[PDB]
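INTERNAL TRANSFER SHEET
From: sequence group
To: structure group
Subject: Coagulation factor XIa

Please process the attached sequence and return the structure record in the designated field. Keep the field labels unchanged so the import script can parse them.
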Amino acid sequence: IVGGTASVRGEWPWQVTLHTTSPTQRHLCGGSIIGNQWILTAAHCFYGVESPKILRVYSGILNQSEIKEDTSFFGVQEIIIHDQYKMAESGYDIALLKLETTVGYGDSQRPICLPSKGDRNVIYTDCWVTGWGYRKLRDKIQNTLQKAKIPLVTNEECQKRYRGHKITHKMICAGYREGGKDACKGDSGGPLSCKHNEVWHLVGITSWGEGCAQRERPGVYTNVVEYVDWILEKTQAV
Ligand SMILES: COC(=O)Nc1ccc(-c2[nH]c([C@H](Cc3ccccc3)NC(=O)/C=C/c3cc(Cl)ccc3-n3cnnn3)nc2Cl)cc1
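Return from structure group:
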Protein backbone atom coordinates (compact mmCIF):
# COMPACT_ATOMS: atom_id res chain seq x y z
CA ILE A 1 0.00 0.00 0.00
CA VAL A 2 1.44 3.41 -0.99
CA GLY A 3 0.70 6.40 1.29
CA GLY A 4 -1.06 4.29 3.89
CA THR A 5 -0.76 3.86 7.67
CA ALA A 6 -0.52 0.89 10.04
CA SER A 7 -3.78 -0.88 10.75
CA VAL A 8 -4.80 -1.70 14.33
CA ARG A 9 -5.27 -5.39 15.30
CA GLY A 10 -8.80 -6.59 14.46
CA GLU A 11 -9.55 -3.59 12.19
CA TRP A 12 -9.90 -5.70 8.95
CA PRO A 13 -10.81 -9.17 10.32
CA TRP A 14 -11.77 -10.55 6.85
CA GLN A 15 -8.22 -9.82 5.53
CA VAL A 16 -6.01 -12.88 5.04
CA THR A 17 -2.43 -13.37 3.90
CA LEU A 18 -2.04 -16.19 1.38
CA HIS A 19 1.40 -17.79 1.47
CA THR A 20 3.04 -20.17 -0.97
CA THR A 21 5.62 -22.75 0.42
CA SER A 22 7.31 -23.23 -3.04
CA PRO A 23 10.31 -22.85 -3.35
CA THR A 24 10.39 -21.29 0.19
CA GLN A 25 7.51 -19.91 2.30
CA ARG A 26 6.53 -16.32 1.56
CA HIS A 27 3.49 -14.05 1.32
CA LEU A 28 1.94 -14.35 -2.15
CA CYS A 29 -1.32 -12.33 -2.13
CA GLY A 30 -4.10 -10.88 0.02
CA GLY A 31 -7.61 -12.35 0.21
CA SER A 32 -10.90 -11.90 2.06
CA ILE A 33 -12.92 -14.32 4.19
CA ILE A 34 -16.43 -14.44 2.66
CA GLY A 35 -17.65 -17.71 4.22
CA ASN A 36 -16.54 -20.28 6.79
CA GLN A 37 -14.55 -22.27 4.22
CA TRP A 38 -14.17 -19.59 1.53
CA ILE A 39 -11.57 -16.97 0.59
CA LEU A 40 -12.19 -14.55 -2.27
CA THR A 41 -9.00 -13.35 -4.04
CA ALA A 42 -7.59 -12.51 -7.52
CA ALA A 43 -7.15 -15.15 -10.23
CA HIS A 44 -3.74 -13.68 -11.36
CA CYS A 45 -2.22 -14.70 -7.95
CA PHE A 46 -2.15 -18.31 -9.12
CA TYR A 47 0.07 -17.85 -12.20
CA GLY A 48 2.25 -20.99 -12.28
CA VAL A 49 0.63 -22.46 -9.07
CA GLU A 50 0.17 -26.07 -10.15
CA SER A 51 -1.44 -27.36 -6.94
CA PRO A 52 -3.36 -26.03 -3.87
CA LYS A 53 -0.97 -28.19 -1.73
CA ILE A 54 1.64 -25.41 -1.72
CA LEU A 55 -0.81 -22.80 -0.26
CA ARG A 56 -1.37 -21.65 3.31
CA VAL A 57 -4.03 -19.21 4.38
CA TYR A 58 -3.35 -17.19 7.57
CA SER A 59 -6.21 -15.29 9.19
CA GLY A 60 -6.24 -13.06 12.28
CA ILE A 61 -2.83 -11.67 11.34
CA LEU A 62 -1.73 -8.07 11.84
CA ASN A 63 2.06 -8.57 11.53
CA GLN A 64 3.78 -10.97 9.13
CA SER A 65 6.26 -11.68 12.05
CA GLU A 66 3.36 -13.55 13.81
CA ILE A 67 3.88 -16.29 11.15
CA LYS A 68 6.47 -18.98 12.04
CA GLU A 69 6.56 -22.77 11.45
CA ASP A 70 4.34 -23.29 14.55
CA THR A 71 1.59 -20.77 13.43
CA SER A 72 -1.80 -22.34 12.60
CA PHE A 73 -3.06 -21.85 9.04
CA PHE A 74 -5.83 -23.17 6.74
CA GLY A 75 -4.90 -25.56 3.97
CA VAL A 76 -6.56 -25.08 0.56
CA GLN A 77 -8.69 -27.95 -0.79
CA GLU A 78 -9.44 -26.29 -4.13
CA ILE A 79 -8.56 -23.21 -6.24
CA ILE A 80 -11.54 -22.03 -8.35
CA ILE A 81 -10.56 -19.52 -11.05
CA HIS A 82 -13.29 -17.80 -13.11
CA ASP A 83 -13.25 -19.77 -16.36
CA GLN A 84 -13.36 -16.58 -18.53
CA TYR A 85 -10.14 -15.31 -16.87
CA LYS A 86 -7.16 -14.80 -19.22
CA MET A 87 -5.28 -11.91 -17.51
CA ALA A 88 -5.85 -9.17 -14.93
CA GLU A 89 -5.99 -6.39 -17.55
CA SER A 90 -8.86 -8.17 -19.41
CA GLY A 91 -11.06 -8.75 -16.33
CA TYR A 92 -12.65 -11.81 -14.66
CA ASP A 93 -9.74 -11.50 -12.17
CA ILE A 94 -11.44 -13.45 -9.42
CA ALA A 95 -10.84 -16.72 -7.67
CA LEU A 96 -12.14 -18.66 -4.71
CA LEU A 97 -10.14 -20.81 -2.33
CA LYS A 98 -12.08 -23.63 -0.71
CA LEU A 99 -10.44 -24.28 2.65
CA GLU A 100 -9.69 -27.79 4.00
CA THR A 101 -11.20 -26.91 7.41
CA THR A 102 -13.77 -24.40 8.74
CA VAL A 103 -12.80 -20.90 9.99
CA GLY A 104 -14.12 -20.33 13.53
CA TYR A 105 -15.43 -16.74 13.60
CA GLY A 106 -14.49 -14.35 16.38
CA ASP A 107 -13.21 -10.83 17.03
CA SER A 108 -9.93 -11.57 15.10
CA GLN A 109 -11.42 -13.27 11.99
CA ARG A 110 -14.86 -13.00 10.44
CA PRO A 111 -16.38 -12.64 6.95
CA ILE A 112 -17.06 -9.46 5.04
CA CYS A 113 -20.56 -9.11 3.42
CA LEU A 114 -20.69 -9.22 -0.35
CA PRO A 115 -22.44 -6.23 -2.02
CA SER A 116 -26.20 -6.48 -2.62
CA LYS A 117 -27.48 -6.59 -6.27
CA GLY A 118 -29.82 -3.71 -5.29
CA ASP A 119 -26.73 -1.76 -4.11
CA ARG A 120 -25.24 -1.65 -7.68
CA ASN A 121 -26.58 1.99 -7.69
CA VAL A 122 -25.29 3.08 -4.20
CA ILE A 123 -22.47 5.68 -3.98
CA TYR A 124 -19.73 4.49 -1.63
CA THR A 125 -17.79 7.34 0.03
CA ASP A 126 -15.84 5.44 2.73
CA CYS A 127 -13.55 2.96 0.85
CA TRP A 128 -10.28 1.50 2.03
CA VAL A 129 -7.58 -0.68 0.46
CA THR A 130 -5.48 -2.88 2.76
CA GLY A 131 -2.51 -5.17 2.50
CA TRP A 132 1.13 -6.03 3.27
CA GLY A 133 2.35 -4.85 -0.14
CA TYR A 134 5.17 -2.51 -1.13
CA ARG A 135 5.09 1.20 -0.23
CA LYS A 136 6.68 2.05 -3.65
CA LEU A 137 7.65 0.20 -6.88
CA ARG A 138 11.02 -1.06 -5.58
CA ASP A 139 10.37 -2.10 -1.99
CA LYS A 140 9.54 -5.16 0.11
CA ILE A 141 6.53 -6.77 1.81
CA GLN A 142 5.60 -4.80 4.95
CA ASN A 143 5.42 -6.43 8.36
CA THR A 144 2.29 -4.52 9.53
CA LEU A 145 -0.97 -4.60 7.55
CA GLN A 146 -1.42 -1.12 5.96
CA LYS A 147 -4.59 0.76 5.07
CA ALA A 148 -5.38 3.72 2.80
CA LYS A 149 -8.66 5.52 2.25
CA ILE A 150 -9.26 6.02 -1.51
CA PRO A 151 -12.15 7.53 -3.50
CA LEU A 152 -13.99 5.44 -6.14
CA VAL A 153 -13.61 6.75 -9.71
CA THR A 154 -16.45 6.41 -12.33
CA ASN A 155 -16.01 3.94 -15.22
CA GLU A 156 -15.96 6.94 -17.68
CA GLU A 157 -13.16 8.70 -15.79
CA CYS A 158 -11.17 5.43 -15.37
CA GLN A 159 -11.47 4.72 -19.12
CA LYS A 160 -10.02 8.23 -19.89
CA ARG A 161 -7.08 7.35 -17.59
CA TYR A 162 -6.34 4.04 -19.33
CA ARG A 163 -6.23 4.83 -23.03
CA GLY A 164 -5.47 1.59 -24.85
CA HIS A 165 -7.23 -0.62 -22.27
CA LYS A 166 -10.87 -1.60 -22.18
CA ILE A 167 -12.17 -0.64 -18.70
CA THR A 168 -15.42 -2.63 -18.38
CA HIS A 169 -18.23 -2.35 -15.82
CA LYS A 170 -16.85 -5.66 -14.33
CA MET A 171 -13.95 -3.42 -13.12
CA ILE A 172 -14.11 -0.65 -10.50
CA CYS A 173 -11.43 2.02 -10.19
CA ALA A 174 -10.18 3.94 -7.18
CA GLY A 175 -7.58 6.60 -6.55
CA TYR A 176 -6.94 10.33 -6.22
CA ARG A 177 -6.47 12.37 -9.40
CA GLU A 178 -3.12 13.64 -8.03
CA GLY A 179 -2.07 10.09 -7.01
CA GLY A 180 -0.37 9.32 -3.71
CA LYS A 181 -2.49 6.48 -2.23
CA ASP A 182 -2.97 3.09 -3.90
CA ALA A 183 -2.37 -0.60 -3.73
CA CYS A 184 1.08 -1.85 -4.83
CA LYS A 185 2.99 -5.17 -5.34
CA GLY A 186 1.92 -7.75 -2.74
CA ASP A 187 -1.54 -6.19 -2.22
CA SER A 188 -3.31 -7.97 -5.07
CA GLY A 189 -6.18 -10.28 -4.19
CA GLY A 190 -6.86 -8.20 -1.07
CA PRO A 191 -10.11 -6.30 -0.41
CA LEU A 192 -11.35 -2.84 -1.36
CA SER A 193 -13.74 -2.55 1.66
CA CYS A 194 -16.49 0.10 1.73
CA LYS A 195 -18.61 1.05 4.76
CA HIS A 196 -22.28 1.80 3.94
CA ASN A 197 -25.11 2.11 6.56
CA GLU A 198 -22.55 1.03 9.27
CA VAL A 199 -21.84 -2.32 7.43
CA TRP A 200 -18.61 -3.14 5.55
CA HIS A 201 -19.01 -4.54 2.03
CA LEU A 202 -16.43 -6.17 -0.21
CA VAL A 203 -16.66 -3.84 -3.19
CA GLY A 204 -13.44 -4.66 -5.01
CA ILE A 205 -10.59 -7.12 -5.31
CA THR A 206 -7.14 -5.47 -5.81
CA SER A 207 -6.18 -6.31 -9.39
CA TRP A 208 -3.85 -4.06 -11.41
CA GLY A 209 -2.69 -0.53 -12.27
CA GLU A 210 -0.03 1.29 -14.28
CA GLY A 211 2.69 1.75 -11.63
CA CYS A 212 1.69 2.61 -8.04
CA ALA A 213 -0.25 5.69 -6.88
CA GLN A 214 0.74 7.70 -9.96
CA ARG A 215 -1.17 10.87 -10.84
CA GLU A 216 -4.21 10.06 -13.10
CA ARG A 217 -3.60 6.25 -12.88
CA PRO A 218 -6.21 4.89 -10.46
CA GLY A 219 -5.98 1.31 -9.19
CA VAL A 220 -8.21 -1.18 -11.03
CA TYR A 221 -10.25 -3.61 -8.97
CA THR A 222 -12.50 -6.55 -9.78
CA ASN A 223 -16.07 -5.13 -9.34
CA VAL A 224 -17.39 -7.73 -6.85
CA VAL A 225 -21.12 -6.78 -7.22
CA GLU A 226 -20.91 -8.06 -10.88
CA TYR A 227 -19.74 -11.49 -9.63
CA VAL A 228 -22.16 -12.18 -6.76
CA ASP A 229 -24.05 -14.78 -8.91
CA TRP A 230 -20.75 -16.45 -9.83
CA ILE A 231 -19.63 -16.57 -6.17
CA LEU A 232 -22.99 -18.11 -5.10
CA GLU A 233 -22.80 -20.61 -7.97
CA LYS A 234 -19.43 -21.85 -6.71
CA THR A 235 -20.00 -21.60 -2.93
CA GLN A 236 -23.68 -22.76 -2.85
CA ALA A 237 -23.37 -25.67 -5.32
CA VAL A 238 -25.84 -28.53 -4.53
C1 LIG B 1 8.93 -12.18 0.86
O1 LIG B 1 7.72 -12.32 0.04
C2 LIG B 1 7.60 -11.48 -1.00
O2 LIG B 1 8.45 -10.68 -1.33
N1 LIG B 1 6.38 -11.66 -1.60
C3 LIG B 1 5.84 -10.92 -2.69
C4 LIG B 1 4.58 -11.34 -3.13
C5 LIG B 1 3.99 -10.74 -4.22
C6 LIG B 1 4.59 -9.67 -4.87
C7 LIG B 1 3.95 -9.07 -6.04
N2 LIG B 1 2.60 -9.12 -6.21
C8 LIG B 1 2.31 -8.57 -7.41
C9 LIG B 1 0.93 -8.57 -7.98
C10 LIG B 1 0.90 -9.41 -9.27
C11 LIG B 1 1.35 -10.83 -8.94
C12 LIG B 1 0.66 -11.62 -8.02
C13 LIG B 1 1.16 -12.86 -7.61
C14 LIG B 1 2.34 -13.33 -8.13
C15 LIG B 1 3.04 -12.56 -9.06
C16 LIG B 1 2.54 -11.32 -9.47
N3 LIG B 1 0.44 -7.20 -8.16
C17 LIG B 1 -0.02 -6.54 -7.04
O3 LIG B 1 0.11 -7.01 -5.91
C18 LIG B 1 -0.63 -5.21 -7.22
C19 LIG B 1 -0.71 -4.52 -8.35
C20 LIG B 1 -1.38 -3.22 -8.45
C21 LIG B 1 -2.73 -3.13 -8.07
C22 LIG B 1 -3.39 -1.91 -8.13
CL1 LIG B 1 -5.09 -1.83 -7.71
C23 LIG B 1 -2.74 -0.77 -8.53
C24 LIG B 1 -1.41 -0.85 -8.95
C25 LIG B 1 -0.74 -2.07 -8.95
N4 LIG B 1 0.61 -2.15 -9.41
C26 LIG B 1 1.35 -1.72 -10.43
N5 LIG B 1 2.61 -1.92 -10.20
N6 LIG B 1 2.67 -2.45 -8.96
N7 LIG B 1 1.48 -2.60 -8.47
N8 LIG B 1 3.40 -8.13 -8.03
C27 LIG B 1 4.41 -8.46 -7.18
CL2 LIG B 1 6.04 -8.13 -7.58
C28 LIG B 1 5.83 -9.21 -4.40
C29 LIG B 1 6.46 -9.85 -3.34
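Handover comment: The first strand starts at residue 5 and ends at 6. The domain at 1-12+112-226 is CATH 2.40.10.10 (Thrombin, subunit H).
Transfer complete.
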